[PDB]
Structure 1
């Protein structure tokens, strides 16, 4: 049942960026595949396990909303192969290239986001990292979550960070709801078309700010065609207090009912 590709069957084309312990390419294997490579010479004992970690988590993910893991390879550097997806990251669509997504399916993006998030959590999986960078879009039609570099059972990306986790507490800040906050940011991003804490400029300050209970996100700005129960859902999820947040086995269920209403 080895999901390792027999030596050198993979091709690798140009770089597309970076991420969590690697680099990404538009390589070939039985078709088009997205591939993460080490890009290092020798493997660290901690990196060894960081690789072997992401493998065992992705091996658990057979789902139509989770980036389909296809194979791995320790020979010729450490590598992770998934399905290639035509289109771009949700971050690009929203902030880099400014795509005016229509509400009808602007919520359908959030649907599929939770569709997969529910699957992960119910199957023990934590995402930790999250972001809307990791919401890779298939054809502008199917949502797939990728890069499980920080998942379980020194640079960062402060924004999709639960205050509790920003503080640093007890070796175990990351939890179910710690994903749900980061997801709440994604909902917000869709509803606003821009990043949280936009009009400032001090990354270092934000860390302390939200991580102490000051810089709550500005709900009062968002596209006016937003549902009345959506603000309610963005609010419930982005809530500062930990256990006060709602779990995914009720997030999407509260969404797929509101998807019925706005059509008119």
Structure 2
């Protein structure tokens, strides 16, 4: 050619870590922890940030896959619809497993390798429809940065449909030479 668990960095408590590779580490309280872990064990899907395990000592910690890239919030503030489809794909999984997120926003949606989706006042309408409202604020962030007519309609319904219907909706939504 030519031309002319190892805890490391604090990310935001969230740390970049080492455990069989790169991993994100988040490190009354016991209960909040027990519940999160308890919920995470029940998730296994490409669009849900992969839970890898927990630690009780030296401190309480949740370990997940590392996502290189950043949050949707970070990015924004056909690809867009795909982010929306994936975001709906994981929310469906969650509800079908009777899980309500309660905190869906562009900060908790991580855009892995700038391709794969991995799951505060502005997103708050708790129920399945409350997450749907939040998700509609995400569509608003996606489409305003701050668009098919069917997508504005879908926004306004979610702002309410459940995720199967939302998914169905989004999914439905010269010569080469030798």
Higher strand share: 2
Unaligned segments of structure 2, at least 5 residues = 174-178
Unaligned segments of structure 1, at least 5 residues = 1-9, 18-22, 38-45, 96-103, 146-156, 163-173, 195-225, 239-244, 259-264
Instruction: Give 1:161 shift.
Output: 0.7
**SS of structure 2 residue aligned to 1:85:** coil
The residue that corresponds to 1:35 in the other structure is 25
Instruction: Give 1:72 shift.
Output: 0.1
Could you tell me the TM-score, scaled by structure 1's length?
0.64
Superposition map of 1:1-264 within 5 A: 10-17=5-12, 23-37=13-27, 46-95=28-77, 104-145=78-119, 157-162=120-125, 174-194=126-146, 226-238=147-159, 245-258=160-173
Instruction: Output the CA distance in 2 between the equivalents of 1:138 and 1:131.
Output: 16
Instruction: Output the CA distance in 2 between the equivalents of 1:192 and 1:122.
Output: 30
Instruction: Give 1:107 shift.
Output: 0.7
Instruction: Output the CA distance in 1 between the equivalents of 2:134 and 2:76.
Output: 16
Instruction: Output the CA distance in 2 between the equivalents of 1:253 and 1:122.
Output: 15
- TM-superposition CA deviations, 1:110-163 (whole Å, max 9, x none): 010001011101110000011110001100100000xxxxxxxxxxx210010x
Instruction: Output the CA distance in 2 between the equivalents of 1:89 and 1:129.
Output: 14
Instruction: Output the CA distance in 2 between the equivalents of 1:91 and 1:13.
Output: 23
- TM-superposition CA deviations, 1:152-190 (whole Å, max 9, x none): xxxxx210010xxxxxxxxxxx10100000000000100
Structural RMSD (CA): 0.5
Instruction: Give 1:249 shift.
Output: 1.4
Instruction: Output the CA distance in 2 between the equivalents of 1:115 and 1:247.
Output: 12
Which segments of structure 1 move beyond 6 Å, counting only runs of 4 or more? none
Equivalent residue pairs, number: 169
Could you tell me the TM-score, scaled by structure 2's length?
0.94
Instruction: Give 1:106 shift.
Output: 1.1
Higher helix share: 2
